[PDB]
Structure formats: structure tokens, C-alpha cells
Amino acid sequence: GPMGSMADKIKCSHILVKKQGEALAVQERLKAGEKFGKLAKELSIDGGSAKRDGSLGYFGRGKMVKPFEDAAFRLQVGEVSEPVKSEFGYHVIKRLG
């Protein structure tokens, strides 16, 4: 969306884990049709986001590690993203509507 516009943000959810396997665990588990938030509450080490069911919701451009944002932008469709490594750790990203 236009710089600071009404929809300048990305609506997404993410699960942050220390291990890729953990990221795979959520990615694999989400397949079972469990609540992303359940996984966020359960797996994600991102507490604030865990509070938010990993549901980041809207966030602006240039806020999270480029790979994270890339996956967020890429999967606006709503597909579970591959593990996204950051300085913080590994993220798994789902789109939020």
C-alpha cells in the first residue's frame, strides 16, 4: 500500500522457533488443520506474537527481517511459508485476513 496508507501494512501471522525442525514442526503440524494461533501459543517463542496467536496482523514495510517480510509478501495468498531465518531465529509465516 502507499507509504503509510490505510493498507500500507501486511496482515500476517508468524511462529518463531530456535530450530528449523521446530519451524518444520509447525509447518508440518499446521497441515493437520490446527489453529495457527494454537501453534503460535504452543511453539512460537515470540511471546507478544504468541499472545497474538502468532497473528502479527498488520505491520508496515521495513520492520521485520527482509526474508521474513519477503515470505510475508510472497505468501499473501495464505500459504505456510518455509522456515525464515533471521538474526532472531527461525520464523514460519502464515497470512492473516
Short mmCIF file of C-alpha atoms in Angstrom, two decimals:
data_model
loop_
_atom_site.label_atom_id
_atom_site.label_comp_id
_atom_site.label_asym_id
_atom_site.label_seq_id
_atom_site.Cartn_x
_atom_site.Cartn_y
_atom_site.Cartn_z
CA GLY A 1 0.00 0.00 0.00
CA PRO A 2 1.11 3.65 -0.43
CA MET A 3 3.57 4.91 2.19
CA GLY A 4 1.56 4.92 5.43
CA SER A 5 -1.73 4.41 3.61
CA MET A 6 -4.75 2.58 5.01
CA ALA A 7 -3.41 -0.70 3.63
CA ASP A 8 0.34 0.02 3.72
CA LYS A 9 0.69 -2.88 6.10
CA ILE A 10 0.83 -6.64 5.72
CA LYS A 11 -1.72 -8.77 7.54
CA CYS A 12 0.18 -11.84 8.68
CA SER A 13 0.83 -14.41 11.35
CA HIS A 14 4.15 -15.96 12.28
CA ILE A 15 5.63 -18.58 14.53
CA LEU A 16 9.20 -18.10 15.73
CA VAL A 17 11.36 -21.02 16.77
CA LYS A 18 15.00 -21.61 17.55
CA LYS A 19 15.28 -24.75 15.35
CA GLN A 20 14.41 -25.32 11.71
CA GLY A 21 12.92 -28.62 12.84
CA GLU A 22 10.66 -26.67 15.13
CA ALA A 23 9.72 -24.48 12.17
CA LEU A 24 9.09 -27.65 10.21
CA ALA A 25 7.11 -28.98 13.15
CA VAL A 26 4.66 -26.10 12.95
CA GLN A 27 4.65 -26.17 9.14
CA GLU A 28 4.04 -29.89 9.18
CA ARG A 29 1.56 -29.69 12.04
CA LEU A 30 -0.43 -26.81 10.52
CA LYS A 31 -1.25 -29.28 7.81
CA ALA A 32 -3.37 -31.16 10.35
CA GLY A 33 -5.60 -28.10 10.26
CA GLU A 34 -4.78 -26.85 13.75
CA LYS A 35 -5.17 -23.20 14.66
CA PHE A 36 -2.12 -21.18 13.64
CA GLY A 37 -2.54 -19.43 16.95
CA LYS A 38 -2.54 -22.80 18.65
CA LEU A 39 0.85 -23.38 17.13
CA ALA A 40 1.88 -19.80 17.94
CA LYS A 41 0.78 -20.25 21.55
CA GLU A 42 2.39 -23.67 21.62
CA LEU A 43 5.59 -23.43 19.58
CA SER A 44 6.47 -19.83 18.83
CA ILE A 45 8.99 -18.19 21.16
CA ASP A 46 7.65 -14.81 20.11
CA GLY A 47 5.62 -14.11 23.21
CA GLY A 48 3.89 -10.96 22.02
CA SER A 49 3.01 -12.72 18.84
CA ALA A 50 2.22 -15.84 20.86
CA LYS A 51 -0.22 -13.64 22.75
CA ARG A 52 -1.50 -12.71 19.33
CA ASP A 53 -1.63 -16.36 18.20
CA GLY A 54 1.36 -15.51 16.10
CA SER A 55 -1.15 -13.25 14.42
CA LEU A 56 1.03 -10.24 13.83
CA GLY A 57 -1.84 -8.79 11.89
CA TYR A 58 -0.91 -5.60 10.11
CA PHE A 59 2.66 -4.44 10.03
CA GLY A 60 4.35 -1.80 7.93
CA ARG A 61 7.11 -2.15 5.37
CA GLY A 62 10.68 -2.44 6.53
CA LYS A 63 10.00 -3.63 10.06
CA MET A 64 10.99 -7.29 10.12
CA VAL A 65 13.96 -9.10 8.66
CA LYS A 66 13.79 -8.86 4.87
CA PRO A 67 13.47 -12.67 4.45
CA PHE A 68 10.56 -12.59 6.90
CA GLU A 69 8.90 -9.79 5.03
CA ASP A 70 9.69 -11.45 1.73
CA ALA A 71 7.87 -14.56 2.79
CA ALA A 72 5.07 -12.39 4.14
CA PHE A 73 4.81 -10.57 0.84
CA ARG A 74 5.26 -13.76 -1.11
CA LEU A 75 2.56 -15.75 0.68
CA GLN A 76 -0.06 -13.05 0.92
CA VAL A 77 -2.04 -15.91 -0.57
CA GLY A 78 -2.03 -17.54 2.84
CA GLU A 79 0.24 -20.49 2.30
CA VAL A 80 2.54 -21.51 5.13
CA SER A 81 5.99 -20.15 4.43
CA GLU A 82 9.19 -22.16 4.59
CA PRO A 83 11.32 -21.52 7.68
CA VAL A 84 12.57 -17.95 7.58
CA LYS A 85 15.89 -17.46 9.27
CA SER A 86 16.60 -14.19 10.96
CA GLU A 87 19.11 -12.88 13.46
CA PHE A 88 16.31 -13.61 15.92
CA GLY A 89 15.87 -17.23 14.84
CA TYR A 90 13.53 -19.14 12.54
CA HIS A 91 10.08 -17.89 11.62
CA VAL A 92 7.17 -19.63 9.96
CA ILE A 93 4.77 -17.19 8.32
CA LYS A 94 1.09 -17.52 7.51
CA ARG A 95 -1.15 -14.78 6.01
CA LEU A 96 -3.78 -13.18 8.24
CA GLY A 97 -7.06 -11.78 6.91
#
